[PDB]
DNA sequence: GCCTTGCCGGGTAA
DNA sequence: CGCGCCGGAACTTAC
DNA sequence: GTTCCGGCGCG
DNA sequence: CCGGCAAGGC
């Protein structure tokens, strides 16, 4: 289980990605903590995203179920666990000291959430400068250049653009990664 | 003249 | 009574 | 993506 | 997120 905290990195990319970790209060004084993972097709979250949450939810003992709740405009994964919500609550805290098999599955889990996924520009939009700018230097530190500006003006939507002159690098050394579960497309692109 | 990458509006998938 | 899992979905907006 | 609702479980 | 347009570089 170099092989959890890995299945745990890809999984934090994307919950920061396209869920959130919450922790609720209700009426009363009852309360509720939510790891949720948002996307729009059913099949990709009950096949490649559901799975490995349950492989990560019995490696922690962690009661709870995975929900999947059909919404309008997407489909919700959910687990309902203060303990699995402060496992990746603590885990993003410590974001800075991701060893870089931990880099590699988050920023592929971070790369489905968010990124161009027709691959003919490699792209990453978010609104959160800062968590960007700690890709950035872990795509330096692996041979993969990149810059950040502005893209959005209205939204403050902050784009991190991967230099076209490395995208072999990139698609083959971190997308298409097999110390860590392979995305779809990449893993697609792998068997053709 | 062929790429690469910043800029920007539309609107879906968060 | 005081909190923490379900199951749904209305609501806002960041990709 | 976010936070409401009513419900149940358990010490 | 997508995709078009254009300034900039080679
Ligand atoms: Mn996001
Ligand atoms: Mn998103
Ligand atoms: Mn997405």
Do not use: C
Not at 47 to 59: K, R, T, V
Not at 84 to 96: G, K, P, Q, S, V
């Amino acid at each position: 289980n170099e092989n959890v905290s890995g299945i745990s990195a890809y999984l934090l990319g994307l919950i920061i990605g396209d869920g959130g970790l919450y922790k609720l209060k209700y009426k009363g004084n009852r309360s509720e903590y939510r790891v949720v993972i948002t996307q729009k097709s059913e099949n990709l979250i009950k096949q490649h995203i559901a799975p490995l949450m349950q492989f990560l939810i019995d490696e922690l003992n962690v009661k709870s179920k995975i929900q999947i709740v059909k919404g309008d405009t997407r489909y919700e994964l959910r687990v309902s666990s203060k303990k699995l919500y402060y496992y990746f609550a603590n885990m993003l805290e410590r974001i800075r000291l991701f060893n870089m098999r931990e880099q590699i599955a988050f920023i592929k889990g971070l790369y489905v959430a968010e990124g161009d996924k027709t691959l003919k520009r490699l792209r990453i939009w978010n609104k959160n400068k800062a968590l960007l700018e700690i890709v950035s230097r872990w795509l330096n530190n692996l041979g993969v250049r990149n810059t950040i500006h502005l893209d959005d003006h209205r939204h403050g939507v902050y784009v991190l653009n991967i230099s076209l002159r490395d995208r072999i690098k990139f698609v083959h050394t971190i997308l298409s990664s097999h110390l860590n579960p392979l995305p779809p497309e990449a893993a697609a692109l792998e068997h053709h």
